[PDB]
Each structure stands twice: as structure tokens, then as C-alpha cells.
């Protein structure tokens, strides 16, 4: 589903022991859980801001819900992330926050059972949108809540079977009571530890999958194939700057007009023409003629023969390259021809040339279509799309020219020294992780007025190089590498 969304219930344990400091003086797992919750909401307020969230504490003294069972108390309903809801969730830190929890509910009772899974299910059974993922991240520690009676455990695993009947997926975050894999108890016929990822690897992203265009390619005049033209380097920037009326915190929604032929009144857009002026002579047109003269072809792609992959140099480009793929929605069974043409293009290295008009009215541009094949292994490592890529070519006034009158020689001694320098400064390039300085400091600067913690967190620059960590990686060959064959000496 495209406009479908994903829910998330955060279940927090507070009966006896997770409120304990583990006889330590570093941190309590309760405030660790509240750290994780506040970080995932401060991430998904700008990353994926239409998911459905909820947070439920179980086991305490009071109970407020819609079914009125004991030891189950919620604070938030399934909704969008609300900045007011996180400004009321941030107060549960420190000793006074623990005291605030203790004097608004306390904790401790003969706590829940199957019934907290029941209130999760009836929390899911009410919201009328579309659902795709339904995960429960439970925050608990112990490995036998059925430490005295077997009917509790039997009805708990039967209730988990009935929740996996409709398939609601729960996978807890186990706390570090041994710091890892030692307490491997019988909490395994319910589900099918790592928290630094949730703490800081979700800073500012966006997620979407649309299509941007659904065109057709014509080979001769009668070979029509239906393709979709996706974009894969979105070139994002900041959300738009809304205008606001001053005091009452409201938008403006301004208007515009045109009038005043030195008589006053109001003129409609029906009496409007366009013009161009050269000195004295002005060529006058109507707007229909202005939009008419940019008409050269139908919307579509036009085949113009083939080419081998040797002349289209990577010096040539003008556009973020798109991606194209066949769909069996318009023309029935065209992926068969596409799979055959893909097979012979990857077997005979050939790449096509085409003429492009994407929208319903546009001057053409020449494109080249390059084949591409997937890569895979056992971990579902799907990293490259099977299909075609569109490189865009310039026409006439783009390739300018330099004055061209410069040529000097060199002498082969510096090749090995430069090899030593590049092998000192050698690294595999990346897989990700060169995040945006301006956007990162902007979203943290917005966060500073959002949650009013203290101040702008200075978002650390990453585009700069570590000058000392390449100074000491280099060494004292800098001055000889300057003046080994070229001394300035003023």
C-alpha cells in the first residue's frame, strides 16, 4: 500500500526491579528506557512523521484504559508524534522525575498477564486507517512472570497464539541484566540488548516510493511498451517557510491582483497578452501561442537505433540519472520482451539511444539507455536494480572551450613519491555516511526551539578532513615533496 502506515506500541515494565539501580551507581534501566523512547520520537518527528505511535506502562497501582482491568495504565493514544506529548514525556528523568512517577501512580502490584496483550490488541482494533507493520517493542527485564502458577503461562502462550493468528509482531528490547546471552529461559514460544542504534543512527531522513512518470516507448511506430520512470537521487532540501500572523499564531493566506491603467478598477486575466521588446519593435503574442511554440512531439520515448558502450564518455552528463522499468498495467505482457531484450543486452553489451519527451508538452532531449543487472547473496542483499539507466547528453552551446594554448612536460620521478602519499591517504570510499552539514545543523536548531532543552546542539561537521590525522599519517615528507624538483625561493 502506498498511503499505508505503521503502528508502534511501547510497553514499559514497572513492577519491582527495573526501577532499581541494580545496586549500581551508573544509570537505571527505567531511565535508559525513557532515553530510548524520547530518542525514537525525536527521530520520527522529522523522519517518518505519519506513523502511528502509542506508549503503555504495565503493572502499576492505578489503571486508566477503555476496558478497566487492573495494573494497566496508558498515557498516549495511537496517533501522530506530538511535541506536547514528548514535552510531557521528558519530565520523567532524574530523581525528581522518578518521584513524579511515584506520586502520580507509584508502582508495584500483582501485575499483568495475558491482559496487557489484550489491551494491546484492543488498542490496535480501533484505529481506522490502513496498517502494514504492527510491532511491539516491550521494555522488560525478567524471564519468568509466571514464577508461581502454570495456568498463567498456559493462557499467556495461548493468547500469544491468538495474537499471532492475526499476526501482531512483538520483539522486545531485553535489558542488560547479564549484559548478554546467559538467561535463555522459556520466553521463546511467544516471540519468533542492542540500543545504541536506536539512540543515534536515525538523525534526519525521509522515506517514500512513488513513480514520477508512466510513459511509453515506441520503436518503429507500432511497438509500444509501457514503462515507469523513477528517480533515485531526490536532491532534498528543507520544508517550506510558512508565513504567520503576529500575535494570535495564525496563517495569513494572502492574495494578488493586477489593475491600474491610471484609471483604477480591476482587470481580469482574460485581457492579457505577452510580448517581447527589441529597442523599438515589440513582437506580441497570446499566451496560447507562447505555450504553443514549445510543442514538438507527443509524450513518450522514441527509439533511434543502437550504440556500443565506448563513445559515451563519462565526461558527458547534464542530469541526475533516472531509472526505468516495465510494468504490466497498461500493455499486457511487455516484461517478457523486456526480459529478453535485457538478456541480449547483457550478453552483447549494447545500449540504446532514444528521444525523450516526458510530460505532455516539452521540447525533446536525446537520452541513452544503458543496461543493468542485479546482485544478490543469501542475506537478501538486493543492492542494484535490474533494468535500464538513462544518461543525458548535451546538444550545442553547453560544451564551451578554453583558450587551449598551454602545454608543458614533466619528469617521471614523482610518481613513486605520490604513490606513497596516496597509499598513506588510502581508504575504501564509502557505503553511506557523509551527512549534510547545513540540514543537520538546521534540524538540530529547530529541535532546540522544539523541545527547549537548553540551546542549539552544535551539530558536528563531517565534510571537513581531519588535518592532524593526515599530518601524522603523512609525516615529514611535505617539504621535500614541495621542493624536490620545484623550489619557489621567492
Amino acid at each position: 500500500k502506498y498511503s499505508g502506515r505503521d503502528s508502534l506500541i511501547f510497553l514499559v515494565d514497572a513492577s519491582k526491579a527495573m526501577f532499581e539501580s541494580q545496586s549500581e551507581d551508573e544509570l537505571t534501566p527505567f531511565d535508559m528506557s525513557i532515553q530510548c523512547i524520547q530518542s525514537v520520537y525525536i527521530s520520527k518527528i522529522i523522519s517518518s512523521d505519519r506513523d502511528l505511535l502509542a506508549v503503555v506502562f504495565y503493572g502499576t497501582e492505578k489503571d486508566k484504559n477503555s476496558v478497566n482491568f487492573k495494573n494497566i495504565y496508558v498515557l498516549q493514544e495511537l496517533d501522530n508524534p506530538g511535541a506536547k506529548r514528548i514535552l510531557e514525556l521528558d519530565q520523567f528523568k532524574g530523581q525528581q522525575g522518578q518521584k513524579r512517577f511515584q506520586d502520580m501512580m507509584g508502582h508495584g502490584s500483582d501485575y499483568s498477564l495475558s491482559e496487557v496483550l489484550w489491551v494491546c490488541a484492543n488498542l490496535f482494533s480501533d484505529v481506522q486507517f490502513k496498517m502494514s507493520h504492527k510491532r511491539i517493542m516491550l521494555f522488560t527485564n525478567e524471564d519468568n512472570p509466571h514464577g508461581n502458577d502454570s495456568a498463567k503461562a498456559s493462557r499467556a502462550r495461548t493468547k500469544a497464539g491468538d495474537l499471532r493468528d492475526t499476526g501482531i509482531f512483538l520483539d522486545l528490547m531485553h535489558l542488560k541484566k547479564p549484559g548478554g546471552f546467559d538467561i535463555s529461559l522459556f520466553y521463546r514460544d511467544i516471540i519468533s540488548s542492542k540500543l545504541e542504534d536506536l539512540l543515534r543512527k536515525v538523525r534526519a531522513k525521509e522515506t517514500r516510493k512513488r513513480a514520477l512518470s508512466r510513459l511509453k516507448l515506441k520503436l518503429n511506430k507500432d511497438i509500444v511498451i509501457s514503462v515507469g520512470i523513477y528517480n533515485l537521487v531526490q536532491k532534498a532540501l528543507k520544508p517550506p517557510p510558512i508565513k504567520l500572523y503576529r500575535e494570535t499564531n495564525e496563517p495569513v493566506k494572502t492574495k494578488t491582483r493586477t489593475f491600474n491603467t491610471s484609471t483604477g478598477g480591476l482587470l481580469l486575466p482574460s485581457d492579457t497578452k505577452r510580448s517581447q521588446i527589441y529597442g523599438s519593435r515589440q513582437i506580441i503574442l497570446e499566451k496560447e501561442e507562447t505555450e504553443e511554440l514549445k510543442r514538438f512531439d507527443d509524450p513518450g520515448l522514441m527509439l533511434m537505433g543502437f550504440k556500443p558502450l565506448v563513445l559515451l564518455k563519462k565526461h558527458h552528463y547534464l542530469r541526475p540519472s533516472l531509472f526505468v522499468y516495465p510494468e504490466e498495467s497498461l500493455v499486457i505482457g511487455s516484461s517478457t520482451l523486456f526480459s529478453a531484450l535485457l538478456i541480449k543486452c547483457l550478453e552483447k553489451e549494447v545500449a540504446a539511444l532514444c528521444r525523450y519527451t516526458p510530460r505532455r508538452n516539452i521540447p525533446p532531449y536525446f537520452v541513452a539507455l544503458v543496461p543493468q543487472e542485479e546482485e544478490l547473496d543469501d542475506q537478501k542483499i538486493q543492492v542494484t536494480p535490474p533494468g535500464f539507466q538513462l544518461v543525458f547528453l548535451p546538444f550545442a552551446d553547453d560544451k564551451r572551450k578554453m583558450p587551449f594554448t598551454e602545454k608543458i612536460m614533466a619528469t617521471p620521478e614523482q610518481v613513486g613519491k605520490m604513490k606513497a602519499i596516496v597509499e598513506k591517504l588510502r581508504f575504501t570510499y564509502r557505503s553511506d555516511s557523509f551527512e549534510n552539514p547545513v540540514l543537520q545543523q538546521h534540524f538540530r536548531n529547530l529541535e532546540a526551539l522544539a523541545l527547549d532543552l537548553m540551546e542549539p546542539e552544535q551539530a558536528v561537521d563531517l565534510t571537513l578532513p581531519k588535518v592532524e590525522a593526515m599530518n601524522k599519517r603523512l609525516g615529514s615528507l611535505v617539504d621535500e615533496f614541495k621542493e624536490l624538483v620545484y623550489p619557489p625561493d621567492y
Binding site: N260, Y317, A396, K399, P465
Partner: protein, 526 residues
Amino acid sequence: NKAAVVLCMDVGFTMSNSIPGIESPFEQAKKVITMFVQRQVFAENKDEIALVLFGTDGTDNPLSGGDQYQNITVHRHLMLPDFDLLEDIESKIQPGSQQADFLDALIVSMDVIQHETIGKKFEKRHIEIFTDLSSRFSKSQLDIIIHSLKKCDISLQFFLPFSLGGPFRLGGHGPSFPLKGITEQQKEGLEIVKMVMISLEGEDGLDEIYSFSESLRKLCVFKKIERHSIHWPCRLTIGSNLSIRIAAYKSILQERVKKTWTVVDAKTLKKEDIQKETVYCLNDDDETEVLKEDIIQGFRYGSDIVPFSKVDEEQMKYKSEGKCFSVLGFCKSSQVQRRFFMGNQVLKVFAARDDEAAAVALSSLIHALDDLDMVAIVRYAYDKRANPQVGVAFPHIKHNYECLVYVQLPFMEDLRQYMFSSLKNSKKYAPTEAQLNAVDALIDSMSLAKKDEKTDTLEDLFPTTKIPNPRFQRLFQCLLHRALHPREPLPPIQQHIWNMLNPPAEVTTKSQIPLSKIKTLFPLIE
């Protein structure tokens, strides 16, 4: 700067010659010249054009004796061209020819440029020369005019007719001469202009000559007339202190027009009697129309809207301390792929000037870097207003120039990656072997590259890097027609446009029976 372009025009006797059975060359001549004039007027550049014409039945020349300077008409002078010259060139479709010579047009035009060059700066000049190379000429003076053309510091480009020595329309990625298109005057004139052009320039003189066929589909009408580019100086740094002063120029960019459509109301044919404005109107309710000093530039956050309009972000904005061209590092892996380039312009960091020991140091740098797949990851910015961007610096070792070419790169906010259903392991979408051989015959018989001459360097026609773009051309000719023909509807687009923009139909005739094989072999389409 400023240039003084000269044109030489022949509508002489053989230019009044008939067809071969297809079309006349005189209308091609007038189409080429009117193309040059509309581009060099509608470019709004600062330049002087002069035209000279021979092949009429009059005599307009300050020197004219007998047959020496006979029918040599200096119709035009070195002025800024306007609509008057194109009015004249769609008022000169008459053949109307008496003529004897075409060599002396060059020297009378060069002499009137000698008598014109007073005061202004003319660093460069070009003449485009349109003789017919088949009428009678004379062998009177050659050494003086060769030395004058070598010494005048003015470039020249000559224009042959459509032949050199199937359905040729104007030019369509096809043949020039039908079966044999030469006479004896064409033989002696072509070998004489070949020896003059060889002695003038040399090897580029083999291609310093153009017909009407492929000079229509190439911008070789523009050579040493425009200013080259704009110089960019900076200082490259590697590590702490490897500051080398480096010059750089821009390259291929998505070109755009430089004229604004102007709003004109009806009944006035004017602009200044139009006030176009916006009103700041708080609606929300029954309206209370507000002023501009109520405006908090509020932003969106989740489910609310927050202030910090203007001066707060002027305080806590982002800086990156001036211009910078640093090197992050290098990478020996060739894992920067072909599909992540993401740039609205590409750069050539080139050299410096003024006793370029710095540029021979960069020549040493790139003559080291060129041997292996080791690239550079440059951090670039322009000023404090500019934004920082990392990108690839490709090596480029060539004959005359040694370049490094810089392209931008994505950040890990611009990538997106989602799952696709692959097609190799299919249960319904398997193509069979007769259909495989059909598409193999398709990709055979629809090719464009051909190899020959026993050296196996590739010969490929249809270069979609020299073909001009149709958009500003069609806009310019539609402007000219609505300027002169005062109330007619807009014409159809011209046929030499589609002559430039059409494929060679012989590959379609080669693969027509494959297309029938596809239609009769493959399963259902629609």
C-alpha cells in the same frame, strides 16, 4: 569584446543554376545565412556584421574598372545588424546574375575592413565565404592574397556546395554526392582552394571547409567570434600546506534563454500602465486586511507551527569560512559508480598563469595519478553564501590539455533504495529461444556503428553532441515570422529541423522484416 564579422555571398550565374532533380542550392544558401543572422541578432551580443554580395546586374564599389571589380556590390557595411538585413534577404530571392570572378571579393572586403577599423577594439574577426566554385575565375594574383590572408589576423571559413567530388534533402546523416558531382572548373577550383587552405592553416584546413549539408547541423558558423569563458582562480590544498594556486573553468551546463515574457494588457499594447501586486489579507474569518509588519516566518514541526522568523536564523545560521577547495583524501577503488554524479555543472580545474611552475607541479600530480584507478574527493565551496559540497575529481590526460574534472556527489539523505522484483528467476516471464534469436536479429540489424579501413577504430555517425538544440531555433524563427507577417497564424516548423533530428531510415529498412517477425512471433501486445 567586439568583433567585425564579414560575409561573402554568391548568387552568381551557377548559383542561378537549376536543380539536380531534388532542390536548389540557393534556397539552402539563404536558409543558412538567415539562420546566422537571426542567431547573431537574437543573441543580443555586442558585435558588428558586414555583408557583401556579388552576382547582381549592378555595380556598387568604390573601385570598379572594366572587369576588375565588375558586379562587386558592397551592399552592406560594418554595422550592428537589425531587421533591415533580413528584410533584404527575404527581398533578394531573385537569381539575377552577371559575374566573372569571386576571388577579389575577399580582398575588397578585407580592404574595406582596413578602412573601417577606426577607434574600436577588434581582437578577432571571421569571414564566412560563399562562392560557388564552378564559375570561371582567373589565376592573376595569388601570392599577395595568400600573404595578406596569412597576415591579416582574420580567420576565414569557406563554403562548398552540397557535393564533394540517397534522398538528400538538406542533411540527414547520409551521402553528399549522388553519383558524380564535379566539372573541370570544380576540379581546378577545388584543388586551388585546397592548396590555398593548406598553405593558410594546414591539417585543420582539411576540415576548414563546409558544405550546405552538415554545416546546417553543426555550429561551425561560430568559431573565434565569442569570448571564450570566465576565469576562476582558487588555491588547492592537500593536508596541511600543499597550497597550489589553481585556475578553473566551467563546462557543460543546461543552457537557458535570456529574455523575459512581458505582460501587456489588452487595448494598450503597453506595460507601464499595469500594476501587478499582492495584498496581505488575513482571511481566517471575515477578512481583516493586514500590513507586511505582522509576519513571523513560521516553520512546521510535526503537529504545530513555531516562530523564529528572521533575525534568529540570521543569528544561528550556518557558516563555512569563505571559499575552500580542500582534499578529503583519495580512493584506489573504482567504486564511485556511473550513476551517482548529480550535478548541474561540471568543472575543469586546469592550471594557473604567470610562469606556471605551479601548473607543472599539478602536471606532475596528474601524471602520477593517471596510471591507476586512484581518484580524489574534493570539498568545494564558492563563498560564504555558497554551500559546501564533496565530489569526485576525475583525471583527464589528453594531447594538448591536462585537466582534472570535478563533479558533485550525494549525501546520505539523497539516496533512497527499495526492493524490486527481479526477472531472472521467473516462472511466467521466460522467453524462448526463437524469440531470443528474433531480438538478437533486432539488435544486429538496428545498429549504427561500423568498423573498416583494417585498423578497427570505430566509425559512428549520428553524433548527439554536435546536433543543435531545436528549441531556441524554433522560437527565433517564430519570432521573426510574427514580427514581419503581421497577423498570420504561426507557421509549421521547418523541414531541415527534422532533417537534423531524424534517424537514418536505411536501418529501419534493414530491420523492417525483423519487426514483422516480432509482431508475429511474440505474444500479445495490448
